C-alpha cells in the first residue's frame, strides 16, 4: 500500500509525544518524559484507502530529508515555541532544497486557560505560508484527528 | 446501516461467513471482521476498505480471505484449528479517517455468529 512519512516537530514540551500518543493509543499521557527520537508505524484508512502511516516523534537533519510531511507544533501558553515555528519551516525547506513541502501548523494545549499567543496570530502566519492551522488538545483529543488527517491529505496530493 | 451475519467443524475444514448490509450510501463503507473467545478480548481478524484493499491479522494471514459483492462482505475461513473457536462479528464504517484494527472505529455491527 501507499506509505506516508510524517514528522512531528516543535520546541521542548509543546506536546509532540502527547499528540502522537493520543492519536494512536487514545489516551492522554500526563507525565514529564522528554524525547530523543521515537517512531511508530500504523495502518490507517484515509478517504477509504488503507495506507501505512510512519510517524517520527522528534526532540524539541537526516529526519528532515526523509520526511514527506511535517507537523509544526507550538503550545498556546508558550510564546518562544510560537517564535520557533518560522525557524523550523526555514530549516525544513533548506534541508529538502524545496519550497513545496507539505506542512500543517498546530497550536496545542487549547484546554489551558493561560494562553500567551493569540489564535489569530497563528491563523495569519499559517495563511501567509498557504498552510492549514488546527487548534489541538492532546488532553481532550480536540483537533488531533483533524491535524494528522489534514497532513496525510497534503502528502497524498503532493505524491500525485 | 444494518448488518446481518450467516458452526461446528473439524480441524483442517472450511466454512463461509456472510455480512449483508442495508442503508444509505453502502459504497462508502469499509468492513471488518472481529472475533471473541468467551471471557477474552475482542480481536481483529480482517478488513476490506471502501476502495477494496484487504488486510488480515497475522494469525489468519493466508488462511482466511475477505471479499465483497460489488452488497455483502464475505469471510472465507479455511484450514481451521481449535484456536479459531469464537463468536465472529462484522462491523462497518464510512469514516474518512480511522485505524481499521480498532473496534472503536466502527459504529455499525452484525448480531454475531458462533464458530466452533
Ligand atoms: N493540558 C494539556 N497538557 C498537555 C497537552 N499536550 C501536552 N501536555 C502536557 O505537556 C507536557 C509535555 O508534553 P510532551 O508531549 O511530553 O512534550 P514534547 O513536545 O513531546 N517534549 P520533548 O520535545 O521534550 O519530547 C506533559 O506534562 C503533557 O502531559 C495538552 O494538549 N493539554
Ligand atoms: Mg516528546
UniProtKB/TrEMBL annotation, chain A:
The keyword Iron does not apply. It catalyses: GTP + H2O = GDP + phosphate + H(+). It is found in: Cell membrane. CDD domains: H_N_K_Ras_like. GO terms for molecular function: G protein activity; GTP binding. Keywords: GTP-binding, Hydrolase, Lipoprotein, Membrane, Nucleotide-binding, Prenylation. Its main location: membrane. Its EC number is 3.6.5.2. SUPFAM superfamilies: P-loop containing nucleoside triphosphate hydrolases (SSF52540). Gene3D superfamilies: P-loop containing nucleotide triphosphate hydrolases. This is small monomeric GTPase. It comes from Dromas ardeola. The gene is Kras.
Amino acid at each position: 500500500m501507499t506509505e506516508y512519512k510524517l514528522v512531528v516537530v516543535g520546541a521542548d514540551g509543546v506536546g509532540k509525544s502527547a499528540l502522537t500518543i493520543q492519536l494512536i493509543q487514545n489516551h492522554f499521557v500526563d507525565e514529564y518524559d522528554p524525547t530523543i527520537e521515537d517512531s511508530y508505524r500504523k495502518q490507517v484508512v484515509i478517504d477509504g484507502e488503507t495506507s501505512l502511516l510512519d510517524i517520527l516523534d522528534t526532540a524539541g537533519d537526516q529526519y528532515m530529508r526523509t520526511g514527506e510531511g511535517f507537523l509544526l507544533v507550538f503550545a498556546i501558553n508558550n510564546t518562544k515555541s510560537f517564535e520557533d515555528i518560522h525557524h523550523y519551516r526555514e530549516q525544513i525547506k533548506r534541508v529538502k532544497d524545496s519550497e513545496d513541502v507539505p506542512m500543517v501548523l498546530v497550536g496545542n494545549k487549547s484546554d489551558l486557560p493561560s494562553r500567551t499567543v493569540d489564535t489569530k496570530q497563528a491563523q495569519d502566519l499559517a495563511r501567509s505560508y498557504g498552510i492549514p492551522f488546527i487548534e489541538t488538545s492532546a488532553k481532550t483529543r480536540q483537533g488531533v484527528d483533524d491535524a494528522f488527517y489534514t497532513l496525510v491529505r497534503e502528502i497524498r496530493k503532493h505524491k500525485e | 446501516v444494518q448488518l446481518v451475519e450467516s458452526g461446528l467443524v473439524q480441524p483442517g475444514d472450511s466454512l463461509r461467513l456472510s455480512c449483508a448490509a442495508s442503508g444509505p450510501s453502502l459504497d462508502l463503507y469499509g468492513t471488518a471482521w472481529f472475533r471473541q473467545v468467551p471471557g477474552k478480548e475482542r480481536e481483529f481478524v480482517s478488513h476490506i476498505d471502501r476502495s477494496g484493499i484487504t488486510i488480515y491479522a497475522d494469525s489468519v494471514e493466508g488462511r482466511f480471505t475477505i471479499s465483497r459483492d460489488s452488497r455483502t462482505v464475505y469471510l472465507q475461513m479455511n484450514t481451521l484449528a481449535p484456536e479459531d473457536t469464537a463468536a465472529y462479528y462484522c462491523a462497518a464504517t464510512r469514516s474518512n479517517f480511522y485505524f481499521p484494527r480498532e473496534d472503536m472505529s466502527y459504529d455499525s455491527w452484525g448480531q454475531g455468529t458462533l464458530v466452533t
